[PDB]
């Protein structure tokens, strides 16, 4: 509990990501498939990392699979908060749930790891409705599609982003 609060920009972005409003397909393409959150310069608020986001419209035209490109956006030596809209298919349902991803690599500086870990339980309480959490502490624990599928529904998941495992 480091007291780091969540900026209103992150809350607004999460609200659009969670609840889908009926909109024209042009606005549907502007929906965020994935987004990264980072500490501010003064380390007082959780803010949106500018330029680090994946749009639904980018999927299928410039982005072939949404997960591997999202992993590439993760810094190698820095901690980051992530929100991934996972579209997967189970043996008896096609599900679309948000995944809160805690990226804290071992190569990250000690100061970054301590602040992000201690403030994770505060930001996740503000983002109500998220039922999946992925804590990755190395590149191996986040780059694999089967790792995300195991967290989503375990062995019951048969597809992820429209591609079989």
């Amino acid at each position: 509990a480091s007291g780091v609060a969540v900026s209103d920009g992150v809350i607004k972005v999460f609200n659009d990501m969670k609840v889908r409003k009926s909109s024209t397909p042009e606005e549907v393409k502007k929906r965020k498939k994935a987004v990264l959150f980072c500490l501010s310069e003064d380390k007082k608020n959780i803010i949106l990392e500018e330029g680090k986001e994946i749009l639904v419209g980018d999927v299928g035209q410039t982005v072939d699979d949404p997960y591997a490109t999202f992993v590439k956006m993760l810094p190698d030596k820095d901690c980051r908060y992530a929100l991934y809209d996972a579209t997967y298919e189970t043996k008896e349902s096609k599900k679309e749930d948000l995944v809160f991803i805690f990226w804290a690599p071992e190569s990250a500086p000690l100061k970054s790891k301590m602040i992000y870990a201690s403030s994770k339980d505060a930001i996740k309480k503000k983002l109500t409705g998220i039922k999946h959490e992925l804590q990755a502490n190395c590149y191996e624990e986040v780059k694999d599609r089967c790792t995300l599928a195991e967290k989503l529904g375990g062995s019951a998941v048969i597809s992820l982003e429209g591609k079989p495992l």
């Binding site: 889908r20 409003k21 009926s22 349902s93 599900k95 679309e96 409705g129 039922k131």
Partner: protein, 359 residues
């Protein structure tokens, strides 16, 4: 894009009209500390909170908790605004008329749904099988119903209710697994036993013959891996747990089995239509997904029915979600758009309009 919600006694099925399978299937529980968790959130905390079933036996008993489940359904599970999509609700058989108006009032005043509709779960199961006349043995989580239907209308005087379903079988499997040395008592361990029941349990055609087979060899034993990596072995408990459906005395229950309940509800109908109900027995619900349950039901009802009657048990492969899939197809039809209860129509006639528009 309409919404289809199947408010089951133990599991809530939700999705969009036109889809083949429900998007969200979560337990219908509300958890409060021993401040309020709904669905899988209430099961993630395990033992700190106490869980309550608002629709425990298909009939809603706590309307304050059901308003939380519907709110959790639209925003957290379906991730849509209920004010922008018409919602199709399903109701259990023998639902009191007071409850039907309550769902209409909640949908239009709290969630502000543009349109709304109520359908009977048993009728949707029968229609999904291509039938309008027959008897539906809808065995769910907390309640088992045998609903004889003639020309699309259920016969209320012949509908029988059995408080014996998958919830009681999961508790019985937990009890008989302790005879092998295992210990499943906690809420988390109850979900593991439920997964064992859904994967390894089956109905034996001849229970006494099957018991002798399991006591003379190990060909019926199966291995299951726990979430912590431990592997357990289950033997004769595979067919003993679902045997309580046909022998409720295994649970200390004084009622009859699902085969006699189906036969008794047939005998409560008109004698001229009993021949049609014998050959049109349709299984529905999750508790009817045990392999060999259709062959066992066929054998048991045959021993009860007259020898000249043709007994035919219908077990469609998609009978687990036949209520929801039937509703989704119906709600996606362009010709069904005139059957909705509009908000304008609700403002004039009030909640009582559901009786004349949805019967």
């Amino acid at each position: 894009a309409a919404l289809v919600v199947d408010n089951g006694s133990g599991m809530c099925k939700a999705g969009f009209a036109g889809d083949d399978a429900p998007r969200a299937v979560f337990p219908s529980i509300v958890g409060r500390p021993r401040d309020s968790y709904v669905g899988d959130e209430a099961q993630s905390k395990r033992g700190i909170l106490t869980l309550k079933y608002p629709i425990e036996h298909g009939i809603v008993t706590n309307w304050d908790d059901m308003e939380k489940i519907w709110h959790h359904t639209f925003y957290n599970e379906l991730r849509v605004a209920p004010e922008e999509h018409p919602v199709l609700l399903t109701e259990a058989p023998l639902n009191p008329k007071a409850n039907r108006e309550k769902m209409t009032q909640i949908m239009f005043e709290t969630f502000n749904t543009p349109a709304m509709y109520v359908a009977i779960q048993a009728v949707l199961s029968l229609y999904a099988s291509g039938r309008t006349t027959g008897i539906v043995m809808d065995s769910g989580d907390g309640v088992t119903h045998t609903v004889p239907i003639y020309e699309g209308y259920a016969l209320p005087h012949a509908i029988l209710r059995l408080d014996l379903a998958g919830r009681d079988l999961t508790d019985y499997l937990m009890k008989i697994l302790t005879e092998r040395g295992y210990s499943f008592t906690t809420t988390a361990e109850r979900e593991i036993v439920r997964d064992i029941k859904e994967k390894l349990c089956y109905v034996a055609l001849d229970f006494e013959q099957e018991m002798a087979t399991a006591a003379s060899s190990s060909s019926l034993e199966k291995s299951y891996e726990l979430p912590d990596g431990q592997v357990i072995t289950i033997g004769n408990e595979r067919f003993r747990c679902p045997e309580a459906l046909f022998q409720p005395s295994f649970l200390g229950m004084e009622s009859a089995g699902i085969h006699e309940t189906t036969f008794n509800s047939i005998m409560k109908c008109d004698v001229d239509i009993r021949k049609d109900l014998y050959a049109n027995t349709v299984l529905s619900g999750g508790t009817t997904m045990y392999p060999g349950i259709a062959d066992r039901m066929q054998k048991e009802i045959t021993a009860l029915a007259p020898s000249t009657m043709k007994i035919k048990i219908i077990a469609p492969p998609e009978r687990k979600y036949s209520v929801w899939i039937g509703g989704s197809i119906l709600a996606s039809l362009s010709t069904f758009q005139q059957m909705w209860i509009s908000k304008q129509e609700y403002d004039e006639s009030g909640p009582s309009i559901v009786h004349r528009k949805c019967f």
